[PDB]
Amino acid sequence: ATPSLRGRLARFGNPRKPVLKPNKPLILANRVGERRREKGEATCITEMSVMMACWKQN
Amino acid sequence: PRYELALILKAMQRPETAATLKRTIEALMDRGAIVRDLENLGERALPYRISAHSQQHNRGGYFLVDFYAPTAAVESMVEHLSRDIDVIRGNIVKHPLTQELKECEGIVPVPLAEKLYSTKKR
Amino acid sequence: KNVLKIRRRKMNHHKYRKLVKKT
Amino acid sequence: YHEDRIRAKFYSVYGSGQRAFDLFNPNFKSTCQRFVEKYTELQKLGETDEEKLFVETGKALLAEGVILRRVG
Amino acid sequence: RQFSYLIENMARDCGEYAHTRYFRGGMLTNARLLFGPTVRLPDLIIFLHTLNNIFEPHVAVRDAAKMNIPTVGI
Amino acid sequence: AKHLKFIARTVMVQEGNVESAYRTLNRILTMDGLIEDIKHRRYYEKPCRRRQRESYERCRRIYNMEMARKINFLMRKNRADPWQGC
Amino acid sequence: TKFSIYPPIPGEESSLRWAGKKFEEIPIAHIKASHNNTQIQVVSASNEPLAFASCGTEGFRNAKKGTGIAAQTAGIAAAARAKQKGVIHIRVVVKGLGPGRLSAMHGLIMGGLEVISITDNTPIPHXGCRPRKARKL
Amino acid sequence: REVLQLQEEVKNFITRENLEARVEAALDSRKNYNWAITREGLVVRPQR
Amino acid sequence: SNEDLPISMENPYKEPLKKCILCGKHVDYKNVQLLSQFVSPFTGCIYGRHITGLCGKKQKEITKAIKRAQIMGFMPVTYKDPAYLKDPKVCNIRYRE
RNA sequence: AAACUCCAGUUGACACAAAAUAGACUACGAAAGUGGCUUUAACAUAUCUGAACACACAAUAGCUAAGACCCAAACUGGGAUUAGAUACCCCACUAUGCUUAGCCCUAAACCUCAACAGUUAAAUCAACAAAACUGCUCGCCAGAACACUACGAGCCACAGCUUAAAACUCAAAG
């Protein structure tokens, strides 16, 4: 669906307390977020440990 | 008013369950209860291990006591079941059939809320 | 809104409490 | 329009027939309005009952030769 | 854009004019600078579509009013 | 726990595919909220902070679900331009 | 037949045997993946200790214990000791979201054991003891 | 009509006379409250 | 005036109002089978209404009945009773896809 | 690092502590506040407004006894960092958070937007914020700063709270 927005913000008609307190108006922007690059992680740590273990034995 | 006693017993043999059930039904009567019916839900395995009266229980017989009693009889019967060592767990609730379910009209999907912000150019 | 007017009362109150403690 | 009640009922009982609407022809009549016309014409006689009238209309349109499915 | 060719043809056939393209700012309010000091502006503007391609009033509707040019509009 | 063991949060390994099992386990825990709850339960989140975070996440879901609905609604119009040139 | 991801119900009859032993009878590998350490203890189906290994027991110290490579060696060390006592198939019960949660499992299979099931047992209070205050970082 | 309906039910209430009798009879029955439902809203009751 | 003008009616094409599967059915804490349908097989977590597809009334009733059935020794808490892992799936949740 | 090593890891037994999921719900209460289960009792007013000479309440923190002790924790002590570090980081532990019986009466107690009755018509409309308004009533305000201050008075409050100025100073403050 989308969660309701009826009687959720502090407005004059609204008798109850605000449920939501948005920092920025809940209004769609005309852009979308930039694709964030995936953080890198060390690679081939398993194969490295296999190699480093043989070194210690030999 | 009408109540229900959700009675988990100690998975005993017929003489002992019959003995235990008779105790409970009399103790209700002794406190002014009009016992309406007794139901056997069967001996199941407990959803989880219940420790009661210095024993670890894994199975138990499930029973229901439909009865009418004065409102003051509830506290007294609750305390009575505390001291019965053949009851694994006993809870008294308002009878679920006393409440009449209101007719429902249907799910009405929520329209998107409007006029939350002024129509000014930001 | 900034808190420049709270900060004046903040220091006033702090100094006053320290003054009462000293005396 | 009052005919809309009849259209709704026909769509609920029988639904949109295999007949494909031709919205280009300004005088196109669908099996629905065909059904409606019969219903409306039989009402001119003086029948004030829907149950009896509907059973008649459904079979009076079958006398003309129609493809209907009452269960779905 | 579905009818830009039709409207451009129709304008040529009746010996009149068409602007079915991106409307550059100031064509009407700044015509003596965009065309030349002696240019003659339209005496009538026919809008066959009054909304631009973001579903808002075409800028020329307002600019025609500023220049005191009557407009016809669908 | 008083409950039975090897029933909750338990996934069977198929054909020794450990990586795929642990992956499905992770999904279950995440899809039910357990992962995020454990992380937030490391330090005490004060009631004022919890309410500020729940409001932020709920304002976020609305916006995210409304943008996703507008993207999905307009996806049909990404097709090739039919009046190319005019 | 459809492979079931749900573990065999103990009471119900089952055909799944891995070394002639029923699901109930397969030893268990308990993995404690802490933020700073990983501990692996293999027990028999009757709760008899068979092998234990942690990142500290393998020589890693201080922050080096809180790594995947340190958690993996502990899995290999535990597997070596568990195979000496006759362990082949193990049920895995992981507890915590530390760095060596999956690396320890890698060390176990890399050490020759065969995982038949994965179970998570991270403690989640329902509501319980108040955790420590937030860090000002 | 309520009092009428109520008057009929009281004939089967557990009194001290029909106590052991009713306890033995209850120990032989097994009332089930378990029924499942489907995506179309149809009660599926376990057959025995 | 004229008879061909729109008649002030109510919408005859209005569809029947969607009711939830549990509409009109008594939810009971003793009916663990029904209650189990609405919890996670793996964690025993209660599903939200966006998964169960329930209305406000019946989500609350199911929620309240589960919390009662659990503490009264009828329904397990940390998982779904293995006896009910074959009940009709009614929840809009997929763990494999 | 210090710390622990009567310590960790499976398993069993075991709260006077706190209440995952549900909750994408938006309900109850005068506000404060209220989200584990059960039961009992129970959520004022058939016009409205209205007590800063009154009453009854009022988060957190504190105070007075008397208990409880899992965890969290001002203070404090160690470890670390640093030019110093009376902090931020680590460990430990206390008041305190809980119960009971009395106090204390304060919060950015703010959704900084009063109650009641209405209107989206006009000219909406300084800016921003949560669009502009009408009737009616009460409560509040009238440059900044001195000042959540001093005096006086009341208060179970004695480093308290509530009421609350002036002189000198400024040409701004906002």
Ligand code: FES
């Ligand atoms: S739609 Fe009727 S109970 Fe939910």
